[PDB]
Amino acid sequence: MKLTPKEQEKFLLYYAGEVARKRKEEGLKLNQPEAIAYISAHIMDEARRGKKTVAQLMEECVHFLKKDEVMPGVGNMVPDLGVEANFPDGTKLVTVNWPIEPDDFKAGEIKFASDKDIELNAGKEITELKVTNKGPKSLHVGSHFHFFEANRALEFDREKAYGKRLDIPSGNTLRIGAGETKTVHLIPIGGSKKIIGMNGLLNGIADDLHKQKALEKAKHHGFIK
């Protein structure tokens, strides 16, 4: 047989699916592991039959188990499911979003203090700036990237972006499509404003003293046209 360690895993998953099937046939509402194994075994079966595409299965398995076919809170506990199976074209990953239909019960439920919005970067002075991606390809810029050092494809008043970053949620990026024009909101960088790296236009404190040197380096390197 030459059973690989991954094949040995799949036997257990498949057997768990078979036990879950038996319990559903008995009329029992399936729990979290039973529900996952029941859907996993279906995917593994269809893959072996090699008549359905990954695309077909991803669609077919949404709400494969209905809210009344599982215990309360099971649907919300499993927002997505992933199962690798061998298809005629090889092993492919079947990714299902909402495999089990949710209900009103939620384990690990978060109840907010207030529905009021969170004021991020509070008290920082906003700078409105028009930017144009004159490049042939779209690009994104992160929340903490030194805006002044962004891809030379971006056309904007760089002097006004010196020592500033995007006033967007931490970890988010702003997209500027090829040819697209946008109004960005910039705020001054926190801490000491010791900008080291990126495009190396600054590599030091973003003070007035470093500004002329930084603008000259930006012009020389093609960021300022």
Binding site: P33, I36, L93, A113, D117, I118, V141, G190, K194, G197
Partner: protein, 564 residues
């Protein structure tokens, strides 16, 4: 900029004032404080915060963290708050706001995210200390994966393996057996500490055991828990700063409960299965829990009190102790009264610890679920604690978490190293998804490394595909396990080079400050009272008021999560 509350919570997890449901229980944890600066939160990923010269510093710093647990919701006796956790040199380096002071506001000075920092996203996760199971019968090495899979990182107790002595008692008796077990311990990821035979009316035999590496002694009735034994054992423990654990004289052969208490003479002692179904003076052993010097714990089978608790015991006692089928009952009248009271005593902070009694009248991977099932049961029966401030169960949560984290650590003299989420302590932490809190952990960190975690298909394109099951990680393997695991010993053994002498490669640390730990020393479970048992009705009384609870027909953190 103004961010929608739902979007903030999805991205970074809950903030100040938000309430989190613990698993499928009716317990609500409220975020007491958030240590972040809104807009400066760390996020890992493509185009995110933790990047060269942005959230990640380019400036060298002596406090560059080895690991950062971003946007964690800490649940500990120290508080229920939101913070970034910084690990360095396998210890909790800092708790607060991590990042780069060069580009960010409000960064905790000793929480530098740099080139050498690894990232772990804790946004929307609950971070707790690793559990300490102070009632382990070292019967089977297979208990260790089961324990880790249930958030337990440290195990105190004793054994030799599947032999009658161990099967019954947490005892690794004598020098040779202690040396053998301490050397066997090298294999595992679990932190260990061994107890020797305390059942002796002779000094020499007790001293030999402490010097052999024992972290204390277990006095167990199977070797005769007589008043002479109790006194001799405590005398040696006092001399050597080690803990004593006790399973009292069930049959009241040499005396009643008061005779045992008298023999102890106000000296520090850890009272296992205080309720008495697991063993001890019938029917009044529970009365010991009211005493200041008595450090009491509970074993998993009697917590919570369910409709099947009594039925299960009236047979489970016969398989463990190997009793005649001629024996039918006494336990049928005695047991309901004390099992019920025990749950309320936990809620009152009278019983300070929860333990397992693993494969010897108790379950290895049940300490954590059963503690939260009891917390939930009481909340459901008695309602929100009067002690609570606001629409939350923070006080109850803190009372219950202390039972399996800090309080066992205080009892065994390891509170300076482990037991809680505090700066300076060893990084033995557990990451939980709130929907699975108390039932199924995500990641187990020991000594700053991931040692055990839930993991999907080994071949798979991502770590999520089925079957997702618990597996050993890098920190549990090779010579890295010697860097992440601790073998606790007595100060005498430690100071006399037990590590070198036994050729132990694991971290060897001494247990210290066992002798002067009273009820007053515990966290959220310092309650002392006059506990009495009616010798006719078997009802339990706390300062003259009937102490009881109703049996549960169903429990939380059970049926929704398990296949079998």
């Amino acid at each position: 900029m103004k961010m929608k509350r739902q979007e903030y919570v999805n991205t970074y997890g809950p903030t100040t004032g938000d309430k989190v449901r613990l698993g499928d229980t009716d317990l609500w944890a409220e975020v007491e404080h958030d240590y972040t600066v809104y807009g400066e939160e760390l996020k890992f990923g493509a185009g995110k915060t933790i990047r060269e010269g942005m959230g990640q510093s380019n400036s060298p710093d002596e406090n560059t963290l080895d690991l950062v647990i971003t946007n964690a919701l800490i649940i500990d006796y120290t508080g229920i708050y939101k913070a970034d956790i910084g690990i360095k040199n396998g210890k909790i380096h800092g708790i607060g706001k991590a990042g780069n002071k060069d580009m960010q506001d409000g960064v905790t000075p000793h929480m530098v995210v740099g080139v050498g920092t690894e990232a772990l996203a804790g946004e929307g996760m609950i971070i707790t200390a690793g559990g300490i199971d102070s009632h382990t019968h070292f019967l089977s090495p297979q208990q260790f994966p089961t324990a880790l899979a249930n958030g337990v990182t440290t195990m105190f107790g004793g054994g030799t393996g599947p032999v009658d002595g161990t099967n019954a008692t947490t005892i690794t008796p004598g020098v040779w057996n202690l040396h053998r077990m301490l050397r066997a311990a090298e294999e595992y990821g679990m932190n260990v500490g061994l107890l020797g035979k305390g059942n002796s009316s002779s000094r020499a035999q007790l001293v030999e055991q402490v010097k052999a590496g024992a972290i204390g002694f277990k006095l167990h009735e199977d070797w005769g828990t007589t008043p002479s034994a109790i006194d001799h054992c405590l005398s040696v423990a006092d001399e050597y700063d080690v803990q004593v654990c006790i399973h009292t004289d069930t049959v009241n052969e040499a005396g009643y409960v008061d005779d045992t208490l008298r023999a102890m003479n106000g000296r520090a002692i850890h009272a296992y299965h205080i309720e008495g179904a697991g063993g001890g003076h019938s029917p009044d052993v529970i009365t010991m829990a009211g005493e200041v010097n008595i450090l009491p714990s509970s074993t998993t089978p009697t917590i919570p009190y369910t409709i099947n608790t009594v039925a299960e015991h009236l047979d489970m006692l016969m398989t463990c102790h190997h009793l005649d089928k001629r024996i039918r009952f006494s336990q049928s009248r005695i047991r309901p009264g004390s099992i019920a009271a025990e749950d309320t005593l936990h809620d009152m902070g009278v019983i300070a610890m929860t333990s397992s009694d693993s494969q010897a009248m108790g379950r290895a991977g049940e300490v954590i679920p059963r503690t939260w099932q009891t917390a939930d049961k009481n909340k459901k029966e008695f309602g929100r604690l009067t002690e609570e401030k606001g629409d939350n169960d923070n006080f109850r949560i803190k009372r219950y978490i202390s039972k399996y984290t800090i309080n066992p650590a205080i009892t065994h003299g390891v509170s300076e190293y482990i037991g809680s989420v505090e700066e300076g302590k060893i990084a033995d932490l557990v990451v939980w998804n709130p929907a699975f809190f108390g039932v199924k952990p995500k990641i187990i960190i020991k000594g700053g490394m991931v040692v055990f975690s839930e993991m999907g298909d080994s071949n798979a394109s991502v770590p999520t595909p089925q079957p997702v099951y618990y597996r050993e990680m890098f920190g549990h393997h090779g010579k890295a396990k010697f860097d992440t695991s601790i073998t606790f010993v007595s100060k005498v053994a430690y100071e006399n080079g037990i590590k070198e002498k036994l050729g132990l490669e694991r971290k060897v640390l001494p247990v210290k400050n066992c002798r002067n730990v009273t009820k007053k020393d515990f966290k959220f479970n310092n309650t002392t009272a006059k506990i009495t048992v009616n010798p006719e009705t078997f009802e339990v009384f706390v300062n003259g008021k009937l102490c009881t609870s109703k049996p549960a027909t169903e429990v939380a953190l059970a049926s929704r999560y398990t296949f079998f």
